[PDB]
Structure 1
């Protein structure tokens, strides 16, 4: 049941709320009895991504501030950041559970180098792994991770803007302020800078991952790669928007 009377009386901070609303563990439903072909591994990754995206929507709904954005913008933001959010969480799990030795997609799906090759994504996996290694270098904290994940949700917008741009900017700025406050709680700027540089670098990796995903999607029949309905909707809609130059990454330390 609800314990809202106690929860409200505890007056949780936004960071406490972020910890509270973190999605629980999602299993890939990996079947180790089936061949580790690219078609099977990518289909499994896509199934996992679809399941994670269901949880992303649930999470976003209870994210402080997100309710202030119109429905169209809520959808746009979830759609435009899907790969970023999942990739960032992937590096987090990899860091937390394996000290960034492996790619921890799920408890039942942990990639070593062999799986990276088998998935047809070796080089892109290595790019992902670089983020995981940055988490070790920085000793990223969970608090930092949770705020950064919100910033990723708020990192990619239409070139011509959102329906309610000012409301979006207010929310994004509020989370930037949360990050600043968190890093400060003699190298505060340095930390803020490193974390925000890392956020910027997510755009570099994610745009590659999306191009690859779009290619796989276009070739999905030939490659025998399955996509769940959630991803079909996301990808089919975003694909021409990205390709026409209408998707705008937001950067801290670039134009």
Structure 2
């Protein structure tokens, strides 16, 4: 009902920039030896710190806040690894031109640490996404929208409490990315981005397989997990292994 307020309201893409979290530090102890146990524990600790900021971000995410508390918690639990790896590839791309894996300003992995972490192939998989960011010259606008799409890429096999509202919100963000890419090779760009998003499901499946394994054997492996991750994984693992998690694809 206000001509002025309507013209001044920031675009959804603009609000995404405003609510994007500041980069979080890992609190990496450079004195300790770079063994798998230490590096994986440090990364899990970093993950806990990041997820606290991700939750605060989702809370002010347009459209998301409108979903039932049950659906929000569910979406965050199902997509945390996807958001983590995607944001990792973005930082590596932005801050090191995809030369290294930039987990945090105080924790940058080169080939040596990827080997030392005991999850080398997984790191290479995430690094490959960063290499695609370079090949595509992905923009921060495209990135922020794609991250929202990842938050909405895995749902309960039987749907959310408000399945209709969710689909509506997902559709709008899809149109947003479609507008950003927007003409000539606009269709091709859109296609490449949605294809990249689909490829995230396979990578995340492998990352989770490893996450769940070190979680079950955390005592024998001496891999530590922060309360935030114990909380997420404890609940996520049984749902995923029971087949209650449904991946949403653009193609296939």
What's the secondary structure of 1:56's corresponding residue?
helix
The correspondence for 1:51, drawn from 18, 25, 49, is 49
What's the secondary structure of 2:65's corresponding residue?
helix
TM-score, structure 2 normalization: 0.97
Give, in whole Å, the separation in 2 of the partners of 1:177 and 1:107: 34
1:97-117 deviation digits (Å, cap 9, x = unpaired): 111110000000000000001
Give, in whole Å, the separation in 2 of the partners of 1:60 and 1:237: 19
Once the two structures are TM-superposed, the CA of residue 10 in structure 1 deviates from its matched residue by 3.6
1:60-98 deviation digits (Å, cap 9, x = unpaired): 011110111000000000100000001000000000011
The count of residues paired between Structure 1 and Structure 2 equals 252
Give, in whole Å, the separation in 1 of the partners of 2:3 and 2:117: 48
1:207-234 deviation digits (Å, cap 9, x = unpaired): 1000100000001001111101111011
Unaligned runs of 5+ in 1: none
Instruction: State how 1:61-140 maps to structure 2 within 5 Å.
Output: 61-140=59-138
Describe the shift of the 1:105–1:70 C-alpha distance in structure 2 as closer, same or farther (beyond 3 A): same
Describe the shift of the 1:124–1:4 C-alpha distance in structure 2 as closer, same or farther (beyond 3 A): farther
1:36-70 deviation digits (Å, cap 9, x = unpaired): 11111011100100000000000001111011100
* 60-69 or 179-188: bigger deviation: 179-188
What's the secondary structure of 1:157's corresponding residue?
strand
What's the secondary structure of 2:246's corresponding residue?
strand
TM-score, structure 1 normalization: 0.95
Once the two structures are TM-superposed, the CA of residue 11 in structure 1 deviates from its matched residue by 1.5
Describe the shift of the 1:232–1:188 C-alpha distance in structure 2 as closer, same or farther (beyond 3 A): same
What RMSD, in angstroms, separates the aligned Cα atoms of the two structures?
A: 2.3
Give, in whole Å, the separation in 2 of the partners of 1:49 and 1:8: 38
